[PDB]
Structure 1
Amino acid sequence: PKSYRNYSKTARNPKRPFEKERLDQELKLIGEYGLKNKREIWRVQYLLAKIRSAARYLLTLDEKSSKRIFQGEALLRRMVRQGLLGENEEKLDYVLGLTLPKLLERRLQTKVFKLGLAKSVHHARVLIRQRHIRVGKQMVDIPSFLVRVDSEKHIDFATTSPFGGARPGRVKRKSLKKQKEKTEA
């Protein structure tokens, strides 16, 4: 038989592919938050969009309808966890008011850029891919990673990086050292 390991599309395409304004917006987003394609943006939109849809559905139901209170509450909690809302704006009408910036902010690369670590967004991204960075014990080499506020404070260079204390341990620095040694002897 077929496997049961079901799989799903994470990103819908646009609809109108050469609308100018939209394109420009996308480009701006890419610039600001160091993203590789429009695909990343689309993916994040999709992520946002599902949530938004859920919120809308919840709002269609009245308060103290069981579903609304439970599912809506859960959604709100999730949003809070994600670092989308926080203290002031936790009422389910607010989770609609999320935009793409709010979501992109919580990408790991963005966070890295914010919290010193690298001079740029691009730099941060490359750092992340190059096996530096850790988010509480666990290393992580995907820049997309949506950091939750619980594990925002616990971000730094990993245990095993060259610039997190674990030898120059490179093709470069090590090679240079070797060369120096050779020169000496």
Structure 2
Amino acid sequence: PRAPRTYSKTYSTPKRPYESSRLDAELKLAGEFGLKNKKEIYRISFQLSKIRRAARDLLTRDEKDPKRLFEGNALIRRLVRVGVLSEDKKKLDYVLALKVEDFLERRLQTQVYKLGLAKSVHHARVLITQRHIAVGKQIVNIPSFMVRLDSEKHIDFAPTSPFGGARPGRVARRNAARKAEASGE
């Protein structure tokens, strides 16, 4: 038979369910950034967990070990590109100081709010899912899309929508027609 397709699980569940102090901290993030699930938080903390595991491992290696040089530089370079880590803090020891809010701040859903365009993080989510936002030429409709530092110049309304320059939507057209027809009465 054909070779197996590989797949993997992307989140982890907190090991004590009813730790009351934790429940409060999670709900503030969801209200601040307009998330729909706790899973959206678990996903981020799962990624952050693995980054620390790798970084902490490398720090056992001596400086000028060729592996620490090669892979350590890759990891730092890759986080700077998305803007999670400042290019001032461009050193491996600072990777251990990142926290969840550093990643949520970079989601397309929040960037479309900080730029204007929308007027709440709840309004921003609606526009993305309804296909009004484009990055460069490509229409994007996923809220969790991580905006790389180059792309921020190119976020704007899509060419093929109202707000972007196309024809009015289905409901505006219906209203104009009935009123025009009645105005002929």
- Scaled to the shorter chain, the TM-score interval is over 0.9
Large movers: runs of 4+ above 3 Å: none
Task: Compare CA radii of gyration and give the structure with the larger one.
Answer: 2
C-alpha distance in 1 between matches for 2:3 and 2:135: 33
Distance 1:164 1:63 in 2: 53
CA drift of 1:150 comes to 1.5
Task: Write the mapping of 1:100-179 to structure 2, written as runs, cut at 5 A.
Answer: 100-168=100-168, 170-179=169-178
Matched, 1:73 2:73: yes
What is the CA deviation profile of residues 110-141 of structure 1, one whole-angstrom value per residue up to 9, with x for unaligned ones? 11111101110011011111111111111111
Partner of 1:94: 94
Per the normalisation by structure 1, the TM-score is: 0.94
1:44-97 Cα distance to aligned partner (Å, 9 max, x none)? 111222222221112222221111111110000110011112321110111221
Task: Look up the match of 1:184.
Answer: 183
Consecutive unaligned residues in structure 1, runs of 5 or more: none
Question: Scaled by the length of structure 2, what TM-score is found?
Answer: 0.94
Query: Secondary structure at 1:144's aligned position in 2?
Result: coil
1:116 maps to amino acid? G
Give the Cα–Cα distance (whole angstroms) in 1 for the partners of residues 51 and 37 of structure 2.
22
1: distance between equivalents of 2:58 and 2:159? 44
Residue correspondences, number: 184
Q: Tell me which moved more, 109-118 or 146-155.
A: 146-155
Contact (CA 8 Å) 1:83, 1:149: kept in 2 or not?
yes
* Aligned-partner Cα distance in 2 for 1:136–1:63: 41
Check if 1:39 corresponds to 2:39: yes
Q: 1:161 and 1:13, CA in 2 relative to 1: closer, same or farther beyond 3 A?
A: same
CA RMSD of aligned residues (A): 1.3
Contact between 1:79 and 1:95, CA under 8 Å: does it hold in 2?
Answer: no
Q: Give 1:12's aligned residue.
A: 12
Say whether the 8 Å CA contact 1:133–1:157 is kept in structure 2.
Answer: yes
- Cα deviation for residue 184 of structure 1 reads 2.4
Please tell me the residue identity of whatever aligns with 1:75: L
Q: CA deviation at 1:181?
A: 2.1
State the one-letter code of the partner of 2:71.
Q
One-letter amino acid of the structure 1 residue matched with residue 170 of structure 2: V
Q: Percent identity?
A: 64
Deviations 1:139-185 (A, max 9, x none): 111101111111122111111121111111x2321222222222222
Q: What amino acid is the match of 1:48?
A: L
Deviates more, 1:65-74 or 1:51-60: 51-60
